Amino acid sequence: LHEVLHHTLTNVDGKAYRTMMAQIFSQRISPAIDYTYDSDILKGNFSIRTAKMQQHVCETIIRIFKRHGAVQLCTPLLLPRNRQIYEHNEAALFMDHSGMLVMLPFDLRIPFARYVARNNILNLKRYCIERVFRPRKLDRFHPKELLECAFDIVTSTTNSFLPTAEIIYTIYEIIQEFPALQERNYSIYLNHTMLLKAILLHCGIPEDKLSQVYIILYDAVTEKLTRREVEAKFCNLSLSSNSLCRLYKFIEQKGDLQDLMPTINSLIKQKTGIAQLVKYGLKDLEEVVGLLKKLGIKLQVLINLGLVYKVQQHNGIIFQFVAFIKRRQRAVPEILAAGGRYDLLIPQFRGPQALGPVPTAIGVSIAIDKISAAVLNMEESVTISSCDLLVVSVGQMSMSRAINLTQKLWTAGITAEIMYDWSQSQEELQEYCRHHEITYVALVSDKEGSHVKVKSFEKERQTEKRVLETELVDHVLQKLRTK
Amino acid sequence: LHEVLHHTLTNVDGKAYRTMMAQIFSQRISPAIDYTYDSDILKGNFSIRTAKMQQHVCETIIRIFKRHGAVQLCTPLLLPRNRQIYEHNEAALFMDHSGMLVMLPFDLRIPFARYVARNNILNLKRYCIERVFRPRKLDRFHPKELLECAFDIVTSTTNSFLPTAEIIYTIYEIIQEFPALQERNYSIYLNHTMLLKAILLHCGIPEDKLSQVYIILYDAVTEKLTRREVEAKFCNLSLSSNSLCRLYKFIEQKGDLQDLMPTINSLIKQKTGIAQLVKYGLKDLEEVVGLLKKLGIKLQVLINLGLVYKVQQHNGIIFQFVAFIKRRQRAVPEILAAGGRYDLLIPQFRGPQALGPVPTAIGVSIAIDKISAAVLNMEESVTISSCDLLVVSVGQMSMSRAINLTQKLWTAGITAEIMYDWSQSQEELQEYCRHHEITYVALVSDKEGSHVKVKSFEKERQTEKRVLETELVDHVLQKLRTK
């Protein structure tokens, strides 16, 4: 089997490979497998409040981005597999009918980097909301799906310090928009890649083994591994304990930039390379902190020495938004955003005839689901109304009048739904209004001539009134304005 | 090879199958193949006008839908392959790492039908904008991508006749809101599936071979096969010319409902099967035409006898918007939308323990790219501005003033973009403003104290005015409200 498979694979354009691919492509699928493929997604229960809340949050976030002059852009869904970048990060893997291997997008940074490299994009601002996929541990199931939002700035200027402040200011605006996010006391963390490399070199880590150290540090940070396992893993590379001790005394310190100056000052007495790296790192950190202070951002700005986050992809400043949420009597951190400068990805994807400088690029990613859950968990629940007014007809002879009234309402810019059944009882109408979250209803009947009865179900008070038909639109507009 | 392949495939959970799946998923991809995978999408050029126009069109369409009380919903991307529904239509096919066969969504109707069936949704309205994929004829390439919009109504009422009128009225509103679509003189076409089946049965086609006739008729309608080829293909189906001769005279008739009455009533003189179908096929058509007349839709309503469109998926009324645009002195019918009732798709996806009545369901689909192309082609081109005001600093010492001015302007709700460089010449600034379609700029300098020189590039007249800093926001708001 192995020999035959290898021989078939040796010529992907051969007749044997083409015939073999078809045979592993025309197999029948049992109905039980088809039904059970996504038994965890389509459970059966449904709720409209969650969809309305998600729509509102997405609309608010979209509105904030458009204020800065941004535009919406999209990238191709499928990209060829590259094991260099996603060696450890497990992504969904798929193969097509032509024998290729493709991957569902793990993140939107790499596709946009490829887009910029292949499209000769120099200056641009961009926002996008799409889905991301993560394969499931169990077999015969659907990939997990999450919602992600992106905001990228691409500039062709030597000055690359203020866009980093603009991104953080945009995230601060989004935080200020929602009262749910304002009570969590978010904090801002910062770090530099050059400073991290200088610290590693000073601690004695060989320059040829840096990537493995980055990977193990990231894995220990994101997995909460035990101290014993971390010590054993480091000793697996035959690394001395003194290097571990000297590295763990540096990543435990976080605080104000002026407070951590004595710690950073000790690194300026090292060799030429260490001093040269720390100079640039300190310069950029100081400048960014100063410009953030000039913008009057109330959120605390802290410099984190041990902040490792996709360090293989960023060349410069990296930041995160960390808030301590008291969940189950435990201060569990939750990340709302992250990003940094990633101009190093452009040289990989350029074509044979690409001439010109490499422009700067700064991006950020937000977790919409966290915002939605935080807003929905608030005790002072936010109520979203699908339609302002609901038109109900009583009797079969009043259907045309209700249809004409509803059509007139739409022409005036008022959102209104029209019920379809004319034999609905009053109790059924009240139950429907309560379930569908509707507070204003207009009853059209032929027993009152050219008058309609507007009913309101507000809190524990039930108010009804008679409104002239010619002034129903004006009455609704006045009520909406006064609301 | 075939015997070994069959033996391996006979046990999908066997060790040999897993080993083959691992081996076929660990191939090496050459850089030349990787670079050329999507060489047809990333053509190397870019334009911001197209993205802005598409964003505007999508925002307008989304705004129209929300006026009716609609909500946004999404469905899982990957669904198991089903050759029963997509036997003829070509769809992109992929296989995951476990050998299971999955398909990229060809359309959004079937995933939403599955969603409704598994979630037992009774009443709901929904809109969604996503992408659809079509595989390419050439080998080693990326699938094609198109943009589609959806609008579905699910009702549990027995007297469900008016939702079709509501859908057609919504599309009429969308047509009205764009001056580009108003000048194309669109038309509305209607038909019924019961009437088509009754016509086929009256023509003498056997009742056990109807699906093949539906498919060949759809193929002839879409691909526009030659008359000789259609006649030859019909003979190959073991069908005599007796059914074909009397079938080409019943699908050439188009006109008003009252004008085509002489043709339709001649089919009510038959057995108890033809008349029973024609009664239902005429009642709903008459009722829908009456309701459309009551709503004052200016678009002419015509009933099409030969309108075949996914007849396998609709049980009831189907409609389609057709406009005879002029392209190279040839009338090419461009379809804007189509849809119909599809309540028959629900029982397929229901579970064996699912119990309850099957509710009605009416949906539609719109081609956004056609709207964007139509609008962008207009001679009186619509100008979209990314930002109202552009803040430009002169000299290195005025950067802080420009930054705080832009922050204050953002605080007041005005969308403004701040330039990053300071040594930019006047000619470069003018070129940048012209390229990005920006009309208002604010030059900040310390040579004029607290005064900001506001420049305008309105047409051929250039206006320079001195504006106090404290009244810049008021000036911008006044200018925006003036026009």
Short mmCIF file of N, CA, C and O in Angstrom, two decimals, chain A residues 196-261:
data_model
loop_
_atom_site.label_atom_id
_atom_site.label_comp_id
_atom_site.label_asym_id
_atom_site.label_seq_id
_atom_site.Cartn_x
_atom_site.Cartn_y
_atom_site.Cartn_z
N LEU A 196 13.06 42.68 23.51
CA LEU A 196 12.99 41.27 23.88
C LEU A 196 14.20 40.50 23.34
O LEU A 196 14.78 39.68 24.06
N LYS A 197 14.58 40.75 22.09
CA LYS A 197 15.75 40.08 21.53
C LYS A 197 17.01 40.48 22.28
O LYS A 197 17.89 39.65 22.52
N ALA A 198 17.12 41.76 22.65
CA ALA A 198 18.28 42.21 23.42
C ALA A 198 18.33 41.54 24.78
O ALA A 198 19.41 41.15 25.25
N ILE A 199 17.18 41.40 25.44
CA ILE A 199 17.14 40.71 26.73
C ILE A 199 17.58 39.26 26.57
O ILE A 199 18.36 38.74 27.37
N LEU A 200 17.07 38.58 25.54
CA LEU A 200 17.45 37.19 25.31
C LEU A 200 18.94 37.06 25.05
O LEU A 200 19.60 36.16 25.60
N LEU A 201 19.51 37.94 24.22
CA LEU A 201 20.94 37.87 23.94
C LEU A 201 21.77 38.17 25.18
O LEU A 201 22.81 37.54 25.40
N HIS A 202 21.33 39.12 26.00
CA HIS A 202 22.04 39.43 27.24
C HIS A 202 22.01 38.25 28.20
O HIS A 202 23.00 37.97 28.89
N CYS A 203 20.88 37.55 28.27
CA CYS A 203 20.76 36.40 29.16
C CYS A 203 21.58 35.20 28.69
O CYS A 203 21.72 34.24 29.45
N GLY A 204 22.13 35.23 27.48
CA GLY A 204 23.00 34.18 27.00
C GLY A 204 22.38 33.16 26.07
O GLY A 204 23.05 32.18 25.74
N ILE A 205 21.14 33.36 25.65
CA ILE A 205 20.52 32.42 24.71
C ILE A 205 21.23 32.52 23.36
O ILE A 205 21.47 33.64 22.88
N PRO A 206 21.60 31.40 22.74
CA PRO A 206 22.27 31.47 21.44
C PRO A 206 21.40 32.14 20.38
O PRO A 206 20.18 32.02 20.39
N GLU A 207 22.06 32.85 19.46
CA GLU A 207 21.34 33.58 18.43
C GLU A 207 20.71 32.66 17.40
O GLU A 207 19.82 33.08 16.66
N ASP A 208 21.15 31.41 17.33
CA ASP A 208 20.61 30.46 16.36
C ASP A 208 19.42 29.67 16.90
O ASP A 208 18.82 28.90 16.14
N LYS A 209 19.06 29.84 18.17
CA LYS A 209 17.96 29.11 18.78
C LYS A 209 16.85 30.04 19.27
O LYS A 209 16.07 29.65 20.15
N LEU A 210 16.76 31.25 18.71
CA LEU A 210 15.82 32.24 19.23
C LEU A 210 14.37 31.82 18.98
O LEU A 210 13.51 32.01 19.86
N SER A 211 14.08 31.26 17.81
CA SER A 211 12.70 30.95 17.45
C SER A 211 12.10 29.92 18.41
O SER A 211 10.93 30.04 18.81
N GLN A 212 12.88 28.90 18.77
CA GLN A 212 12.38 27.90 19.71
C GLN A 212 12.06 28.51 21.06
O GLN A 212 11.07 28.15 21.70
N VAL A 213 12.90 29.45 21.52
CA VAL A 213 12.64 30.13 22.78
C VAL A 213 11.36 30.95 22.69
O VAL A 213 10.54 30.96 23.62
N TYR A 214 11.17 31.66 21.57
CA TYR A 214 9.93 32.41 21.38
C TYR A 214 8.72 31.48 21.45
O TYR A 214 7.72 31.79 22.12
N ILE A 215 8.79 30.33 20.77
CA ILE A 215 7.66 29.41 20.73
C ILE A 215 7.36 28.85 22.12
O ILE A 215 6.20 28.78 22.53
N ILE A 216 8.40 28.45 22.85
CA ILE A 216 8.15 27.85 24.16
C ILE A 216 7.62 28.90 25.13
O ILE A 216 6.74 28.61 25.95
N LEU A 217 8.12 30.14 25.05
CA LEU A 217 7.60 31.19 25.91
C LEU A 217 6.13 31.48 25.60
O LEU A 217 5.31 31.61 26.52
N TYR A 218 5.78 31.57 24.32
CA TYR A 218 4.39 31.80 23.94
C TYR A 218 3.50 30.66 24.42
O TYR A 218 2.40 30.89 24.95
N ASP A 219 3.95 29.41 24.25
CA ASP A 219 3.15 28.27 24.66
C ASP A 219 2.97 28.23 26.17
O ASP A 219 1.87 27.94 26.66
N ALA A 220 4.02 28.54 26.93
CA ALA A 220 3.90 28.60 28.38
C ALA A 220 2.99 29.73 28.83
O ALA A 220 2.30 29.59 29.84
N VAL A 221 2.97 30.84 28.10
CA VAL A 221 2.10 31.96 28.42
C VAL A 221 0.63 31.64 28.14
O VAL A 221 -0.24 31.97 28.94
N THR A 222 0.35 30.99 27.01
CA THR A 222 -1.03 30.79 26.58
C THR A 222 -1.64 29.48 27.08
O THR A 222 -2.84 29.26 26.86
N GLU A 223 -0.88 28.62 27.74
CA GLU A 223 -1.39 27.33 28.19
C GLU A 223 -1.38 27.14 29.70
O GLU A 223 -1.94 26.15 30.18
N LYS A 224 -0.77 28.06 30.46
CA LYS A 224 -0.70 27.97 31.92
C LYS A 224 -0.09 26.64 32.36
O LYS A 224 -0.64 25.93 33.21
N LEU A 225 1.06 26.30 31.78
CA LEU A 225 1.76 25.08 32.14
C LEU A 225 2.37 25.21 33.54
O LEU A 225 2.65 26.30 34.03
N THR A 226 2.57 24.06 34.18
CA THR A 226 3.13 24.04 35.51
C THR A 226 4.61 24.42 35.48
O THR A 226 5.29 24.32 34.46
N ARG A 227 5.11 24.87 36.64
CA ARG A 227 6.50 25.28 36.74
C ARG A 227 7.44 24.11 36.48
O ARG A 227 8.48 24.27 35.83
N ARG A 228 7.10 22.93 37.00
CA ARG A 228 7.95 21.76 36.81
C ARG A 228 8.07 21.39 35.34
O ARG A 228 9.17 21.10 34.85
N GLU A 229 6.95 21.40 34.61
CA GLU A 229 7.00 21.08 33.18
C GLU A 229 7.78 22.12 32.40
O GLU A 229 8.50 21.78 31.45
N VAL A 230 7.65 23.40 32.77
CA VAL A 230 8.42 24.45 32.10
C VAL A 230 9.91 24.24 32.34
O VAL A 230 10.72 24.37 31.41
N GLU A 231 10.30 23.92 33.58
CA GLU A 231 11.70 23.68 33.87
C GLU A 231 12.22 22.46 33.11
O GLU A 231 13.34 22.49 32.57
N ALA A 232 11.43 21.39 33.05
CA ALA A 232 11.85 20.19 32.33
C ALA A 232 11.99 20.46 30.83
O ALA A 232 12.93 19.97 30.19
N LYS A 233 11.05 21.22 30.26
CA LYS A 233 11.11 21.51 28.83
C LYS A 233 12.35 22.31 28.47
O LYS A 233 12.99 22.05 27.45
N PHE A 234 12.71 23.29 29.31
CA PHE A 234 13.91 24.08 29.05
C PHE A 234 15.16 23.22 29.12
O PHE A 234 16.08 23.37 28.31
N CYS A 235 15.21 22.30 30.09
CA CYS A 235 16.34 21.38 30.21
C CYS A 235 16.38 20.35 29.09
O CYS A 235 17.40 19.67 28.94
N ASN A 236 15.31 20.22 28.30
CA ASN A 236 15.32 19.29 27.18
C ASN A 236 16.23 19.78 26.06
O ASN A 236 16.75 18.97 25.29
N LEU A 237 16.42 21.09 25.95
CA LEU A 237 17.35 21.67 24.99
C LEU A 237 18.76 21.81 25.56
O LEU A 237 19.58 22.53 25.00
N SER A 238 19.04 21.11 26.67
CA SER A 238 20.33 21.19 27.36
C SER A 238 20.69 22.64 27.69
O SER A 238 21.82 23.09 27.50
N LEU A 239 19.71 23.38 28.19
CA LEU A 239 19.89 24.76 28.59
C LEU A 239 20.16 24.83 30.09
O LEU A 239 19.49 24.17 30.88
N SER A 240 21.14 25.64 30.47
CA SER A 240 21.56 25.74 31.86
C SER A 240 20.48 26.42 32.71
O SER A 240 19.64 27.16 32.21
N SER A 241 20.53 26.14 34.01
CA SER A 241 19.55 26.71 34.93
C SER A 241 19.81 28.19 35.18
O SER A 241 18.88 28.94 35.51
N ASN A 242 21.07 28.64 35.06
CA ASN A 242 21.36 30.05 35.28
C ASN A 242 20.69 30.93 34.23
O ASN A 242 20.21 32.02 34.54
N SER A 243 20.65 30.46 32.97
CA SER A 243 19.93 31.20 31.94
C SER A 243 18.44 31.29 32.26
O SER A 243 17.83 32.35 32.08
N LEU A 244 17.85 30.20 32.74
CA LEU A 244 16.45 30.23 33.13
C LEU A 244 16.21 31.23 34.26
O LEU A 244 15.25 32.01 34.22
N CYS A 245 17.08 31.21 35.27
CA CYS A 245 16.91 32.12 36.40
C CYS A 245 17.06 33.57 35.96
O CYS A 245 16.28 34.44 36.37
N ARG A 246 18.05 33.86 35.11
CA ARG A 246 18.26 35.22 34.64
C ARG A 246 17.15 35.68 33.70
O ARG A 246 16.89 36.88 33.61
N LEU A 247 16.50 34.75 33.00
CA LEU A 247 15.37 35.13 32.15
C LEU A 247 14.09 35.33 32.94
O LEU A 247 13.25 36.15 32.56
N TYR A 248 13.91 34.60 34.05
CA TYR A 248 12.68 34.72 34.81
C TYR A 248 12.70 35.87 35.81
O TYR A 248 11.67 36.15 36.43
N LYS A 249 13.84 36.54 35.98
CA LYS A 249 13.88 37.74 36.80
C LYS A 249 13.54 39.00 36.01
O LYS A 249 13.37 40.06 36.61
N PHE A 250 13.44 38.89 34.69
CA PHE A 250 13.19 40.05 33.84
C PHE A 250 11.75 40.13 33.36
O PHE A 250 11.20 41.23 33.22
N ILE A 251 11.11 38.99 33.11
CA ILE A 251 9.74 38.98 32.60
C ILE A 251 8.70 39.07 33.71
O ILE A 251 7.50 39.04 33.41
N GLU A 252 9.12 39.17 34.96
CA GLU A 252 8.20 39.30 36.09
C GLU A 252 7.93 40.75 36.47
O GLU A 252 7.19 40.99 37.43
N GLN A 253 8.51 41.71 35.76
CA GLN A 253 8.41 43.12 36.11
C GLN A 253 7.54 43.85 35.10
O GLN A 253 7.76 43.74 33.89
N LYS A 254 6.55 44.59 35.61
CA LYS A 254 5.70 45.43 34.78
C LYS A 254 5.33 46.67 35.58
O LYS A 254 5.15 46.60 36.80
N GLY A 255 5.21 47.80 34.89
CA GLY A 255 4.87 49.04 35.56
C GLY A 255 5.06 50.23 34.64
O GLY A 255 5.15 50.08 33.42
N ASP A 256 5.12 51.41 35.26
CA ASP A 256 5.29 52.64 34.51
C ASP A 256 6.65 52.67 33.82
O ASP A 256 7.61 52.05 34.27
N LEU A 257 6.72 53.42 32.71
CA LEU A 257 7.96 53.51 31.96
C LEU A 257 9.07 54.13 32.79
O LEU A 257 10.21 53.65 32.78
N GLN A 258 8.76 55.19 33.54
CA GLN A 258 9.76 55.82 34.39
C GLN A 258 10.09 54.97 35.61
O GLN A 258 11.18 55.12 36.18
N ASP A 259 9.18 54.08 36.03
CA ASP A 259 9.44 53.22 37.18
C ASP A 259 10.42 52.10 36.81
O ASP A 259 11.31 51.78 37.61
N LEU A 260 10.29 51.53 35.61
CA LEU A 260 11.14 50.43 35.17
C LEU A 260 12.44 50.91 34.54
O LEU A 260 13.18 50.08 34.00
N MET A 261 12.72 52.21 34.58
CA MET A 261 13.98 52.71 34.04
C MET A 261 15.22 52.10 34.70
O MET A 261 16.17 51.79 33.96
#
